[PDB]
Design a protein around this ligand. Structure first.
Ligand code: ADP
Ligand code: ADP
Ligand code: ADP
Ligand code: ADP
Ligand code: MG
Ligand code: MG
Lengths: 76, 433, 96, 438, 445, 432
């Protein structure tokens, strides 16, 4: 049994590939392979074109007061 | 023990002054070559020079490989001796230069002192301690001890199904847990338990043993390039997903050099430079020869013995470049050439007699003379190979010794290369291609 | 999942046509690795002996001021991989 | 019903057909003629059986159709299944997974068998009554009792937890004839001494019974484990090696592993634990090996773990593969010096007729004497293999016309329907332009 | 199946019951001698008593070699394995050529497995232990059977089972109203969900509710499964379905063909022999058809000697249209069919001849019938004349362009003018070669 | 703006320029001349559209620059995007990962399209409440803009809901047959005004209509895609990476049978297409031998090929054959020959290229450029079109004149002038 090899390097080397978020764009807008097994044709083709939010709806919901409390169930 | 082609070669048969006795240690001739090999053996034993190359040159059957194995026998089993054939560099996993470099490091051995820490006893308490550690109680015939061990050791104990009453062996260095059996004291409780019982250990619970380990530089390189000592999931993953050899870098070899130098300085390691032997060197190509230039120029390299029976032959990997031994002239400038000669009929008879004695065969003088005559034509190898079939024929006929009739009958049954060549030439139109 | 095999997929029951297509004889002619290990237990106990001359842990990378997120990320990855895969490696215990 | 093994080229060869003095009979065990070659093969077979000399090489050389492979198959059948016999073609060493030297090393090591003999205590009996009491809920110690019976004994065993678990997993019931190995606790069911209760449903059709074992319950039996050096190398190369025993995919085994195995097997041999059973490697068509492979063969035969190597080639003075050098048999002269050569002479008319008779007997084909004469003439004119093929061709033609014996007309019909190399080449010369590349 | 391929008209060898070949039958025209020889080979395959026998179909291109092999396959039927293969396929980036050949050899040997699967289906109506009036040991309750009531669409049956099934019932969590099946050959209980009659429209479970089984409670059937030795070899070399780390690695790693060892193949052979002896399985030795055998190299040809000499090998059919060509992998070695003379000694050669104009006209008419094309007598004669020059393949390839051209012109049959226009539009090999030779400077290389 | 598709060598080709009778117009849809070749291409295109006959091979042969690839692009354009058209070069079958025959098999199976049609019942709504009792049983409330209902959950449904961490406000769909749950988005409320959002969260409107809905999905996949999907456990990943390897033939046979079953059941339709191999002379003899018998399958598309070789050497052999293709394969295919263009055709092609690139040229410039194209090559003149346009724009001109064409002729050399200049200084260049 031998001790492992302790390989020492400069701390700056481990940050060579790191880029600050304010210096890089969002690559998730080109992520096609990440959608497989998670996103369906229904969501992309039928649902989202109909049920996308609009700025008007978002503003109306944000400005409107809280909805009334949901009524308690009644056996009727 | 089976009798191989070189089983009679026990040494170089040299006297105290270095001169070669005529017949000694299973060697009959090649006195000049044996004396040169004695000098090479002294060079290897000096452990001072690095990368010194020797070429054994001569026709086939002149005992080049016998002389290399005799050098091995003179050195002893402690000194590494790596035999490789030139055809073995053509691997489908790593480059030819990598194969050569790995064989170079295999020739350098290292005797290193190591201390093994052992926990051995019957388990009396196995209490997890919340990742969960283990508190274990071990008893022997001399005492009892309680130990706190790492969670990895607890996982190993669980995998071994160790329960209270089992005799276990723990190696603290490698964390290797072995369950040996249920203690013998419980062997009477049942009639069919499906258990293997083991007596109680009779020493102490904790032992320290110092042993000498024989390793090579290649072993260290492999251990640090394909690690399996962490016992973690990543090591298993790397072993299963990457089982092939890899081209170990010069950086790893430099680190191993530093580690071994540190060990030698600490006084716990001894270096044995050792020998590499390449038998069919002409099978290497020009890339291998060019690499061997720089490899032999290294101050870490071992002593390399090369062999060749080729004449003025085209170097493999070149189109039409022809060199004296199949070896480019640049590498021949870096080698000491030991020349082997053809054997006289008397030496052939001596070798035949030695091989007969080695194979446990009694041969009459008339049969020995006839077989030496058979070896004068054809080859010595062919004459030696007729000993066992002739013995089998004599045994079938009820004779305990080989007579001339058995040798004649066997030679009639089996042809040599020249006779087969004559048959092929006479009937070229009937054989394929 | 088992496309083009003598072993049929997991039919829900006899109502499915796959229930009456595959035979147990074809199934018993295919041995899983666990069945192979059970078949070679005596051979494993008697003929598996070769040990590496040297054993070392993997080389470790050390920096004075590393990114403080690299080591915890590697630790979490290793922990998850071990928790998912170590139970599956138990059959290979005797060989190791 | 037809087994997986059917009538092949050498199905009629059951051995070399020699007597005690290794003298070949004219026609015995399928072999006809080739007296000198069969005698040489017998001497080589005795050398193999003695198993004392390592790395012996024999070359069977002759013209096509002279019985080189017949002699090799006769040697294989005379050796028996106890001694390993690895038969490969020269082309098989060219592999994308491993080097040629590695493939040759594996072939060599597949031809040496390591046998471990040990004695173990064994309990074999008829289960009379098995009782297992287990806690209703939660972890607890199962307690059980087992009764085993032979024709002359009956003992009641108190069972431990692990034996209880083994019996539960094997689902051992009364009337089951079981075998128990005391050390490992393995239980193997080998039959039922009688049927299960009839009143039960969904039990299936009951098979035949097995007679109860006699003698004492706990006997001592000799267990023999035999593996080859290649199997040890593969299972020791890596953790997943045992699967590599079936999938191939061994890669290139480290030389360190093989050296350790050689040392351990030598130690076992010295300690009486294991015996080495050297065998034969038969490389058919060795002329497909290149110079690098031949150079490896030269030195690999010098090991004490090397088997007997038998090669077959029908080449004359031919270029060695991978080089531009003409050599006898396509083999370098350095390797030809390390081996004894067994020449096979062509067959005569009577030997050809006897081979045809043996083939007809193997194929269960009845033929007339005139048909035998015509077929022997065709075999002498064309080749032995063509006549052998015509045997079953004419059998099928005769059976089509509701006959019982193959006549000259059937042989002529199949001679017209199926062509040899000579007549095909003539007809191709007649239409040379119609064929594509000349 | 609906699309028409080049050999869609070949329905077998047009052989009389006596083996003589009819002039035109089963889609085949002429080649009477070759067809008779192929019928003898079909009888050889059906006899199932020969192994490793090889047949070489030798003749100029377009002479029915592939058509004859496919006719043999039609004669044998779908029961007999028929593994087509071209010689170029042995060159793989994963396994060696000999391994490809061996795998194709094992694909041709088939195995037919017959088993009876007896099951008891039903919805559990009753689950009642059968106690004994004399409890063993004095205390507690002992049970000797467990009565399970199974209900199906057209019946209801009760099963007095072994007491040991109580554990299986609890492990499967079987209660009343659940649909289960019990296998006689194993004595195990499997819960295939709950009956759908107890499901409400407001439930959201997916695989829990199952329809009440139709038919009888006791279902038994004979299962015929056809497998090949290569299937067993591959399923054992790279097994699928384990839960150990090695199976997980197999699922993760990219699949790759491996060099299956003789050990695994011998084990498969032993298992197959055991099944055959038990009566479970019947061996079905088939045919390996290796088209363009001349594309094999010298290593493949050499390996074929040992492959064919085996007693497990199938009947191999080769096909080559080459003359005195150079064997691949060799430097300037010429053999009569691109095949070394050693392998020619192991094969029976069937010669295919060229077609007379009448046979070409018959084949063109048959191909027109297969493609659903009506062709006039004058157009057929012109197309046969076109086939006398050029080749037969060229003439049969003008049928669909001429039919399309007629349909565009508004006619339901091919007239001579349509064939003339198609012949003007499309060139054959010889006419293109004449153009190339006349303008060799303007072309490349 | 500048889209990813820009002016290429065949951007001016929109079709084969034929009428209803497949008679080629002199200049239509961007094609000039090659009347016989275009008519043959149209006949082959009708054969492709019918789809009845399998494994038909056509070779477009002719001198370099005679419109072979132009005709192939015209066929591809005229053929709808619905019908597959796999265009590969001969060199692309030489792969380090799979054999040549495997590459050709994958290319063949990429040329057959399978259009699937699945109809599935789903539940679609916004999650209002999830109550689980203790996790054996629970209730789920889903709502739309026009409906609201409560569902009783089982063990597997509860486990699936907990695994996906479905909570209130999530808009989800549940497949009735399989029970799989996919999250479409979440509803926006006043309290969900997040400052930071996860990479997958998105706000959607609550669905309207009825909670139970039918989902119909129609998509076109090729046989190669189905092969890759079923090659391994996550084989669809190889449709992005390309690390397919050699797919087992048994898998392909199973998929052929399954596709036939789908076609009988009405769940799939087969659209055989075209495999165009450009510069086939790069194929080796093994590839041609494989092509001979690959075309004989019932699932073989139309193989269109194009070579400009005369009687040359077959790759991998020492034999000479009329197109570099062995005569055995040439008997399996119909040859469409392209003739050299005349002066009028060259001028018309130059006009079409100038219109495509939006370059104005004088008639004298057109005459000079046509003379250059006849003397040197058509492609050289086509390149000079853009060169002269750039030079004209540099001098602030609006129409290319003869001076611009002469200037770019002096600046840029064709092969003949460059070869002459090299021969003048032959010793300067390396390895003559
Ligand atoms: N001088 C010698 N004395 C005894 N045996 C010898 C001698 N030289 C060679 N031999 C034996 O004869 C055989 C041929 O020698 P070898 O070393 O193989 O020749 P090569 O130089 O061709 O390798 C071997 O069995 C070897 O042990
Ligand atoms: N002496 C013999 N006795 C019996 N059968 C023989 C004999 N010689 C050849 N045969 C048979 O004839 C065929 C050709 O012989 P074979 O050994 O294959 O020739 P080769 O020397 O080319 O290998 C085989 O079927 C073989 O079994
Ligand atoms: N005798 C025949 N009867 C009917 N069709 C034939 C006949 N011979 C060839 N064909 C057909 O002509 C075409 C030529 O292919 P084929 O003859 O198989 O070429 P090859 O023999 O060179 O492989 C195929 O469509 C084949 O079905
Ligand atoms: N008939 C045609 N109509 C329009 N453009 C053509 C025509 N023939 C060739 N071209 C154009 O000339 C150039 C070369 O023709 P191309 O078909 O690529 O040559 P090749 O036939 O040698 O492949 C391309 O830019 C192509 O668009
Ligand atoms: Mg042979
Ligand atoms: Mg082009």
């Amino acid at each position: 049994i031998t001790p492992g090899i302790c390989f020492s390097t400069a701390s700056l080397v481990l940050r060579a590939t790191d880029v600050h978020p304010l210096q890089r764009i969002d690559m998730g807008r080109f992520d096609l392979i990440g959608l497989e097994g998670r996103v369906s044709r229904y969501e992309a083709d039928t649902f989202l074109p109909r049920h996308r939010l609009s700025r008007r709806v978002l503003l109306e919901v944000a400005t409107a007061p809280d909805p009334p409390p949901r009524p308690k169930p009644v056996k009727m | 023990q089976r009798i191989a082609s070189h089983s009679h070669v026990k040494g170089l048969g040299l006297d105290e002054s270095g001169l070669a006795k005529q017949a000694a240690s299973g060697l009959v001739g090649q006195e000049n070559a044996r004396e040169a090999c004695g000098v090479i053996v002294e060079l290897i034993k000096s452990k001072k020079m690095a990368g010194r190359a020797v070429l054994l040159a001569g026709p086939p059957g002149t005992g080049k490989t016998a002389l290399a194995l005799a050098i091995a026998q003179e050195l002893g089993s402690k000194v590494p001796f790596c035999p490789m054939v030139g055809s073995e560099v053509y691997s489908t996993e790593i480059k030819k230069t990598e194969v050569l470099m790995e064989n170079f490091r295999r020739a350098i051995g290292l005797r290193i002192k190591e201390t093994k820490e052992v926990y051995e006893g019957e388990v009396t308490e196995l209490t997890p301690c919340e990742i969960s550690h283990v508190i274990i109680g071990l008893k022997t015939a001399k005492g009892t001890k309680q130990l706190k061990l790492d969670p990895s050791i607890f996982e190993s104990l669980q995998k071994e199904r160790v329960e209270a009453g089992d005799v276990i062996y723990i190696e603290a260095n490698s964390g290797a847990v072995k369950r040996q059996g249920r203690c013998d004291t419980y062997a009477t409780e049942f009639d069919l338990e499906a258990e293997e019982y083991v007596p109680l250990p009779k020493g102490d619970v904790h032992k320290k043993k110092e042993i000498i380990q024989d390793v090579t530089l290649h072993d260290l390189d492999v251990a640090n390039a394909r690690p399996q000592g962490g016992q973690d999931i990543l090591s298993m993953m790397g072993q299963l997903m990457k089982p092939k050899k890899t081209e170990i870098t010069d950086k790893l070899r430099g680190e191993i050099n530093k580690v071994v130098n540190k060990y030698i300085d600490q006084g716990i390691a001894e270096l044995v430079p050792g020998v590499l032997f390449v038998d069919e060197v002409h099978m290497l190509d020009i890339e291998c020869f060019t690499y061997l230039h720089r490899a032999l120029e290294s101050s870490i390299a071992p002593i390399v013995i090369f062999a060749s029976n080729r004449g003025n032959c085209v170097i493999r990997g070149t189109e039409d470049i022809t060199s004296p031994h199949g070896i480019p002239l640049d590498l021949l400038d870096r080698v000491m050439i030991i020349r082997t000669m053809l054997y006289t009929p008397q030496e052939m008879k001596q070798i035949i007699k030695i091989r007969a004695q080695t194979e446990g065969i009694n041969i009459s003088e008339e049969a020995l003379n006839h077989l030496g005559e058979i070896g004068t034509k054809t080859t010595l190898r062919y004459s030696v190979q007729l000993l066992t079939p002739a013995n089998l024929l004599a045994k079938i006929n009820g004779k305990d010794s080989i007579e001339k009739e058995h040798v004649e009958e066997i030679s009639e049954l089996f042809y040599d290369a020249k006779s087969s060549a004559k048959i092929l030439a006479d009937q070229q139109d009937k054989y394929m291609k | 999942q088992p496309v083009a095999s003598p072993i049929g997929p997991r039919s829900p029951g006899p109502s499915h046509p796959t229930f009456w297509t595959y035979t147990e004889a074809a199934h018993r002619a295919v041995l899983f690795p666990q069945q192979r290990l059970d078949q070679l237990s005596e051979i494993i106990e008697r003929f598996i002996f070769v040990m590496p001359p040297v054993e070392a842990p993997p080389p470790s990378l050390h920096a004075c001021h590393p990114p403080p997120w690299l080591a915890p990320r590697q630790a979490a990855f290793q922990e998850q991989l071990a928790s998912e895969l170590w139970p599956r490696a138990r059959p290979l215990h005797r060989i190791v | 019903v037809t087994r997986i093994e059917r009538i092949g080229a050498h199905s009629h060869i059951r051995g070399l057909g020699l007597d005690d003095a290794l003298e070949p009979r004219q026609a015995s065990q399928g072999m006809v003629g080739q007296l000198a070659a069969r005698r040489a093969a017998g001497v080589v077979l005795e050398m193999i059986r003695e198993g004392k000399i390592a790395g012996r090489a024999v070359l069977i050389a002759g013209q096509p159709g002279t019985g080189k492979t017949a002699i090799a198959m006769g040697m294989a059948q005379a050796l028996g299944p106890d001694t390993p016999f690895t038969a490969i073609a020269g082309s098989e060493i060219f592999s994308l997974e491993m080097s040629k030297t590695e493939a040759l090393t594996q072939a060599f090591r597949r031809s040496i068998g390591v046998r471990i003999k040990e004695e173990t205590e064994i309990i074999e009996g008829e289960v009379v009554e098995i009782q297992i009491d287990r806690p209703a809920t939660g972890t607890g110690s199962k307690v059980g009792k087992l009764t085993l019976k032979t024709t002359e004994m009956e003992t009641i065993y108190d069972l431990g937890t692990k034996m209880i678990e083994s019996l539960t997993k094997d689902k051992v019931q009364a009337g089951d004839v079981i075998t128990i190995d005391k050390a490992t606790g393995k239980i193997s069911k080998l039959g039922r001494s009688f049927t299960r209760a009839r009143d039960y449903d969904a039990m299936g059709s009951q098979t035949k019974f097995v007679q109860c074992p006699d003698g004492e319950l706990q006997k001592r039996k000799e267990v023999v484990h035999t593996v080859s050096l290649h199997e040890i190398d593969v299972i020791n190369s890596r953790t997943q090696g045992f699967l590599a025993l079936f999938s191939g995919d061994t890669g290139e085994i480290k030389s360190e592993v093989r050296e350790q195995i050689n040392a351990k097997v030598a130690e076992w041999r010295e300690e009486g634990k294991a015996e080495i059973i050297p065998g034969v490697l038969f490389i058919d068509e060795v002329h497909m090996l290149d110079i690098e492979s031949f150079s490896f063969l030269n030195r690999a035969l010098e090991s004490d773990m090397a088997p007997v190597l038998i090669m077959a080639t029908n080449r004359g003075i031919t270029r060695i593969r991978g080089t531009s050098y003409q050599s006898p048999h396509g083999i370098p002269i350095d390797l030809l010096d390390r081996l004894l050569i067994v020449s096979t002479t062509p067959y005569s008319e009577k030997d050809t007729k006897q081979i045809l008779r043996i083939r007809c007997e193997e194929e269960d084909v009845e033929m007339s004497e005139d048909a035998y004469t015509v077929l022997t003439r065709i075999g002498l004119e064309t080749s032995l293999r063509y006549a052998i093929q015509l045997i079953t061709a004419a059998s099928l033609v005769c059976r089509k016309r509701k006959g019982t014996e193959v006549q000259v007309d059937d042989i002529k019909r199949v001679y017209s329907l199926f062509l040899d190399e000579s007549r095909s080449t003539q007809y191709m010369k007649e239409y040379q332009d119609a064929f594509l590349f000349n």
